[PDB]
């Protein structure tokens, strides 16, 4: 009370949470207070000083919530699957307060329809289609998103992981929403957060770029992009341009770090996501790709010693002697269709592996960072070889 003539010593005490002891932040990132199943309830029981002169309030994702017990300092709450922000705010009668903030992880059951974020598919755009990846999602007849009931979910069979395709309503404004999966029976299951944005948001592929060659960037509303500026060099002509992807020619820049910005058609600034931080400026590392060798050279360790196609030599030691530690070697390889199997390995002249033997079925690019130890061993062991069977070396580059 305030009208009180005076406050007892115990009333004016600082608030302390004695038990339980909560973990400290990981490294700015919040710690986990609870890790329970969707069928179990969030159960935390506080002991607090002063005994009879403290009130505690609970917040799930910033929203105040009743403690499901007669006591106000024990919470009992049934939560849907997901990860939740929990705040524990303790206040005394004379207004002094202490605080705890942590995560509550609620795991689904095996048979539950469930979904987590794999890559960046939880960033969605109003009017457009989006994907959920998870388990048992063929059960879902509706998704609930910020008051809207999305009733057109389609479970797509894929060569990779299957997904639940759904359309975001146009009416939904920007922000973060906690989605819920609904059965035909009516049962509801948690599927964590979705982020709705109208912004042209570049998400991945924009950290690194090779000068004077194709550069593919992945985002959400990238068709609205009118131009990108790297260094001081503006690019307004693109090879591909869709919602999810844009490809351009990285301009002729010296090796180093550069600022990238962009402009939409409306004139607003292109946004960039890096570690769940959104900026209007992106740091791009540019490097030039040097060609060391070009052609079409078959490799088979079946062929006899002395045969030019038993290995890939053809890049002399003095070239590798010049390469600086940290550089990325790339070997572009293609299969021989008539070959029974396809295995390759990068090695020294002594056939010491610089990395694992790899088995493959399709054409590709093998990249490997050459450390100072690797470079030293190459000089010590008679140079560089590509070894294996049933493939061709078509290009070798370094940057
Ligand atoms: O055949 C099918 C089968 O192939 C398997 O792969 C085999 C491959 O078939 C073999 O040809 C290959 O043999 C290489 C040896 O593994 C490798 O150690 C050896 O390297 C020699 C090098 O030839 C030689 O010049 C070097 O001499 C140096 C001295 O050691 C130094 O003291 C001196 O100062 O300088 C000289 C340099 O001139 O010694 C090294 C070894 O120490 O080269 C062989 C080929 O010539 O082995 C492969 C297995 O690793 C494949 O695994 C199967 O799957 C496949 O069915
Ligand atoms: Na799955």
**What's 263's domain CATH number?**
2.60.40.10
Q: Assess whether 304 and 281 both reside in one domain.
A: no
Domain that holds residue 63: 16-107
Q: Are residues 389 and 334 in the same domain?
A: yes
* 356 CA distance to ligand 2 middle (Å): 29
Give Cβ neighbours of residue 27 (< 8 Å, ≥ 6 apart). none
- Atom index in ligand 1 nearest the CA of residue 310 equals 11
Indicate if 294 and 333 belong to the same structural domain: yes
Number of structural domains found in the chain: 4
Measured in whole angstroms, the distance separating CA 222 from the mean position of its chain's CA atoms is 19
- Compute φ and ψ for 20, nearest 5 degrees: -80, 160
Placement of tokens 């105040």 in the chain: 64
In-domain check, residue 5: no
Find, among 217, 245, 249, 219, the residue nearest to 233 by Cα: 249
Is 306 a member of any domain?
A: yes
CA 260/CA 57 separation, integer angstroms: 45
Residues 294 and 393 in one domain: yes
Q: Which residues contact 279 (CB under 8 A, 6 or more apart)?
A: 271, 272
Domain identity same for 381 and 309: yes
Distance in Å, CA 35 to ligand 1 centroid: 54
Task: Specify if 309 maps to a domain.
Answer: yes
Residue 9 included in any domain: no
* Torsional class of 90: left (φ above 0), alpha (ψ -120 to 50), beta (otherwise): beta
Check pocket membership of 301 for ligand 1, CB cut-off 6 A. Answer: yes
Looking at the structure, do residues 299 and 374 belong to the same domain, yes or no?
A: yes
Examine residue 1 and state whether it is found in any structural domain, yes or no: no
**Which of 240, 265, 287 finishes a domain?**
287
Minimum CA distance residue for ligand 1 atom 25: 350
DSSP calls for 142-164: EEEETTEEE---EEE--SS--EE
- From 287, 310, 336, the end of a domain falls on 287
* Number of residues in the chain: 399
Ligand 1 geometric centre to CA of 345 (Å) = 14
Q: According to DSSP H, which parts of the chain are helical? A: 317-322, 372-380
| Chain centre to alpha carbon of residue 28 | 18
Atom 51 in ligand 1: residue holding the nearest Cα: 301
Residues 49 and 137 in one domain: no
CB 312 within 8 A of CB 297: yes
Do both 120 and 145 map to the same domain?
yes
In a domain, 8, yes or no: no
Structure tokens, 174 = 């920007």
Q: Tell me which residue has its CA closest to atom 41 in ligand 1.
A: 350
Task: Pick from 303, 345, 350, 380 the residue to mutate for probing ligand 1's pocket: most ligand atoms within 8 Å of its CB.
Answer: 350
Q: Is 382 in the pocket of ligand 1 (CB under 6 A)?
A: yes
Q: How far is the CA of 117 from the centre of ligand 2 (A)?
A: 12
Q: Are residues 283 and 297 in the same domain?
A: no
Q: Is residue 255 part of a domain?
A: yes
Ligand 1 pocket residue status of 341, Cβ below 6 Å: no
Compute the distance from residue 160 Cα to the ligand 2 centre, in Å.
10
> Measuring from atom 24 of ligand 1, which residue has the nearest CA?
350
Residue 386 in any domain: the answer is yes
Q: How far is CA 373 from each of CA 69, 329, 380, 384, rounded to the nearest angstrom?
A: 63, 15, 10, 14
Are 283 and 301 contained in the same domain?
A: no
Indicate the residue among 196, 217, 238 that finishes a domain: 196
Q: Judge if 71 and 102 occupy the same domain.
A: yes
* Separation between Cα atoms, residue 264 and residue 74, nearest integer Å: 51
Q: Please, are residues 221 and 198 in contact by the beta-carbon 8 Å criterion?
A: yes
End-to-end alpha-carbon separation of the chain, Å?
A: 72
Q: Both 244 and 324 in a single domain?
A: no
Which residue is closest in CA terms to ligand 1's atom 6? 301
Q: How far apart are CA 151 and CA 140, in angstroms?
A: 9
In order of 33, 79, 86, 100, 320, the CA distances from 20 in angstroms are 10, 21, 15, 11, 60
Tell me how far CA of residue 282 lies from CA of 6, 122, 204, 229, 239, in angstroms. Answer: 59, 21, 11, 10, 21
Q: Whose CA is nearest to atom 23 of ligand 1?
A: 350
Identify the nearest ligand to the CA of 382 by its number.
1
The atom of ligand 1 lying closest to the CA of 305 is: 46
Q: In whole angstroms, give the CA distance from residue 343 to residue 300.
A: 9
Ligand 1 within 6 A of CB of 155: no
The number of the ligand 1 atom at minimal distance from the alpha carbon of 352 is: 18
Shortest-distance atom of ligand 1 to CA 387: 6
User: Which whole-number Å values give the CA distances from 248 to 212, 225, 234, in the listed order?
Assistant: 10, 12, 11
């Amino acid at each position: 009370t305030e009208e009180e003539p005076f406050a007892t010593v115990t009333e004016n005490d600082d608030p302390h949470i004695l038990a339980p002891v909560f973990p400290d932040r990981t490294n700015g990132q919040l710690a986990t207070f609870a890790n329970i199943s969707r069928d179990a309830n969030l159960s935390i029981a506080l002991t607090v000083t002063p005994k009879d002169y403290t009130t505690v309030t609970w917040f799930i994702d910033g929203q105040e919530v009743e403690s499901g017990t007669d006591s106000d300092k024990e919470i009992n709450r049934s939560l849907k699957a997901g990860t939740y922000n929990l705040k524990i705010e303790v206040e005394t009668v004379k207004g002094k307060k202490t605080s705890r903030e942590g995560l509550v992880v609620v795991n689904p059951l095996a048979d539950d329809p469930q979904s987590k974020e794999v890559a960046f598919e939880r960033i969605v755009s109003p009017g457009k289609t989006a994907r959920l990846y998870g388990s048992n999602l063929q059960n879902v007849t509706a998704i609930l998103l910020g008051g809207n009931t999305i009733t057109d979910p389609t479970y797509v069979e894929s060569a990779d992981e299957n997904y639940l395709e759904y359309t975001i309503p146009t009416g939904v404004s920007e922000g973060d929403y906690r989605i819920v999966l609904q059965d035909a029976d009516g049962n509801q299951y948690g599927a964590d957060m979705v982020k709705v944005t109208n912004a042209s948001l570049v998400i991945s592929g924009a950290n690194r770029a090779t000068a004077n060659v194709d550069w593919t960037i992945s985002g959400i509303n990238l068709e609205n992009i009118a131009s990108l500026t790297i260094g001081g060099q503006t690019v307004s002509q693109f090879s591909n341009q869709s919602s999810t992807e844009i490809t351009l020619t990285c301009p002729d820049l010296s090796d180093g770090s550069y600022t990238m910005t962009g402009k939409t058609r409306s004139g607003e600034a292109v946004q960039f996501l890096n570690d769940n931080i959104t900026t209007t400026e992106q740091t791009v590392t540019v490097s030039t790709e040097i060609t060391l060798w070009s052609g079409h050279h078959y490799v088979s360790w079946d062929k006899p010693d002395g045969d030019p196609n038993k290995t890939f030599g053809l890049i002399p030691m003095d070239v590798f002697a010049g390469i600086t530690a940290g550089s990325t070697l790339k070997v572009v390889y293609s299969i021989e269709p008539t070959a029974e199997y396809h295995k390759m390995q990068l090695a020294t002249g002594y056939w010491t592996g610089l990395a694992s033997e790899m088995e493959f079925t399709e054409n590709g690019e093998y990249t490997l960072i050459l450390t100072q130890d690797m470079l030293n061993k190459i000089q010590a062991e008679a140079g560089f070889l590509c070894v294996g069977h049933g493939y061709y070396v078509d290009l070798v580059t370094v940057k």
